[PDB]
Homo-oligomer: A and B are copies of this chain.
């Protein structure tokens, strides 16, 4: 059945489910629950009470049929002529009962709503939230809006019975309905604002209800096409007629009819409630990749924001795709924790064959070209099973890595034309002997990046300027205390006025909250930049190096010599990925002491293993022609890495061993 339901969903139903699930993911979803859901669990319907009142008011029992106004009028007449304590007596007699929850409540909670809005006065959803473990602030009276313990609400618009079974806590007659806007100003305001700034799904109401139509009249006078159309989940025995469908859709609604989706009997209400509640919504929380163009579109939606950066570490890609795959330092992709369509396998298959690419539609071949260029520049090749002869290369284009001071002087002298140039220039000044000129330029870039952008240069400028401030302050500590002896003179590199201003500005800054204050779109588009504000960026690489060290050293103690590829090629590949990423993205982390300690321990292990394998060409080779050839030799990049990150004692330690 369920497969058939997913298959019979028209384009509109699929789009509606897409939007609902995406909004649930973003944390902006809300449910408007009616009375049908509360009748699924047995609970005295209002009409029943309307009968009793009638039987009490006129001696006769119920006759014929009741109109819409009679429901709100007969209780009113009974209140008027008999009194208040009889109304309350009947209310208490009928409503003081305990009833169990039902699966629909559990499913609704499983959807992870942000708030909840309901027109029921029973506490079924309260017990549901109390069992599921969710915490909501219950609002059922005017005094509860001001003193709210949390930031998420369970909003009973018409009241409840948490302060007694009197008729003043609820809204159940015509007088209460007429004077609503005057007795409930704050609750009405709160409901309206929540509707304005959230995605709303109706459940268990049924069109033609007083509340749905009252709110459709507000949306016509209180809106200028500046709102998002609510959704509706209709559960009626027979399918909705087309005329009513168009009339209500034109009137600000998006209907989803469960009767059309699946077939059932007249009185199988729970069946149709479940067939559309969550049996379709949660199960459809996965993607919908089934075509050769949706693959490109999805991968583009994920990779496009990273065109702002120059390079991406391969390990970090594991976070971009949410653990759907493994990306290896040698350039191979390996499936992991993905149960849906394999879109990386499809992408590489399309890469190999030209005809499959020709099958792509217009405006989608250029997105493939962009993704292909990105993956080629970053060094991603293919899936692991189809691996060829993987090669190793090094190329860092940073002018600062190569120590070309005069060219950076010239570059800083020249005029800039974009904020990218100023970003690079601020990196340079700092790499030259200027903390005062780079600080000012970072603050200036932070000023001028107000214009529409990704928010990437802004965030990275903030991080870099905080780091430069830290560097300035530590020098002063060793300038007016140790510098007085190092040179024999009180070197005053920065004025007291400057050091005072920078301290006043950087007094409230907390790098711990810099990413949490960013717009939510940036946080869901650049979550790999979050690790650039702490010691979490070098955690996976140090845990790996601490392990490969214990492994290589145990083999050198045993006296074993393998004839395959080195066991420390991963140490070399990770080291050069970290260097390219930090220097090509102009980050001041390249100056930190923990990064210098990481590069020193990685380079020491490689040279020690190279000495062990040089002398083995006499033990194995000397006893038998059979032997090996692969090795490690110094080149430009290795010389400059040792010269910038090792102390003379560190070099002497390796020269004795």
Contacts and interface: CB of A to CB of B under 8 A. Distances in A.
Interface of A: 27, 110-112, 130-135, 149-152, 282, 285, 446-447, 450, 462, 505, 507-508, 510, 513, 517-521, 534-536, 538-540, 542-543, 545-547, 549-557, 594, 597-598, 601, 604, 647, 649-650, 653, 656-657
A511 to B, nearest CB: 12
Nearest to A131: B447
Contacts of A601: 543, 546, 549
A130 B447 contact: yes
Nearest to A110: B507
Contacts of A508: 110-112, 282, 285
A519 B150 contact: yes
Chain B CB count within 10 A is highest, among A510, A521, A597, A598, for A597
B542 A543 contact: yes
A546 B653 contact: no
Contacts of A553: 653, 657
30 contacts: A130-B447, A133-B446, A134-B517, A135-B519, A149-B521, A150-B517, A150-B520, A282-B507, A282-B508, A534-B539, A534-B540, A535-B539, A536-B536, A536-B539, A539-B542, A542-B545, A546-B594, A546-B598, A549-B597, A549-B601, A550-B604, A551-B649, A551-B650, A551-B653, A552-B647, A552-B650, A553-B657, A554-B656, A555-B649, A556-B649
Given A150-B517, A285-B508, A534-B540, A135 B594 contact: no
B550 A653 contact: yes
Contacts of A656: 554, 557
Given A110-B508, A546-B598, 7 more contacts: A130-B447, A534-B539, A534-B540, A535-B539, A538-B543, A542-B542, A543-B601
B598 A649 contact: no
A550 B657 CA distance: 9
A432 B555 CA distance: 31
A556 B647 CA distance: 12
Contacts of A538: 543
A546 B152 contact: no
A528 to B, nearest CB: 13
A431 B601 CA distance: 35
Contacts of A135: 450, 517-519
A654 to B, nearest CB: 9
Chain B CB count within 10 A is highest, among A111, A510, A535, for A535
Contact of A535 (B111, B535, B543, B594): B543
A520 B597 contact: no
Contacts of A546: 542, 545, 594, 597-598, 601
A609 to B, nearest CB: 13
A548 to B, nearest CB: 10
A462 B133 contact: yes
B649 A543 contact: no
A647 B554 CA distance: 13
Given A450-B130, A542-B543, A542-B546, A152 B551 contact: no
Chain B CB count within 10 A is highest, among A508, A553, A555, for A508
Contacts of A507: 110, 282
Contacts of A505: 132
A543 B604 CA distance: 13
A649 B553 CA distance: 9
Nearest to A597: B546
A114 to B, nearest CB: 10
Contacts of A536: 536, 539
A542 B601 CA distance: 11
A380 B545 CA distance: 33
Contacts of A604: 550
Contacts of A149: 519-521
A520 B151 contact: yes
A459 to B, nearest CB: 10
A162 to B, nearest CB: 14
A657 to B, nearest CB: 7
A596 to B, nearest CB: 9
Sorted nearest first, the 6 A-B pairs with minimum C-beta distance are: A539-B539, A552-B649, A546-B597, A149-B519, A535-B543, A535-B540
Contacts of A650: 550-552
Contacts of A540: 534-535
Contacts of A521: 149
A607 to B, nearest CB: 13
Nearest to A557: B656
A422 to B, nearest CB: 16
A571 to B, nearest CB: 14
A597 B152 contact: no
Chain B CB count within 10 A is highest, among A132, A510, A517, for A517
Contacts of A520: 149-151
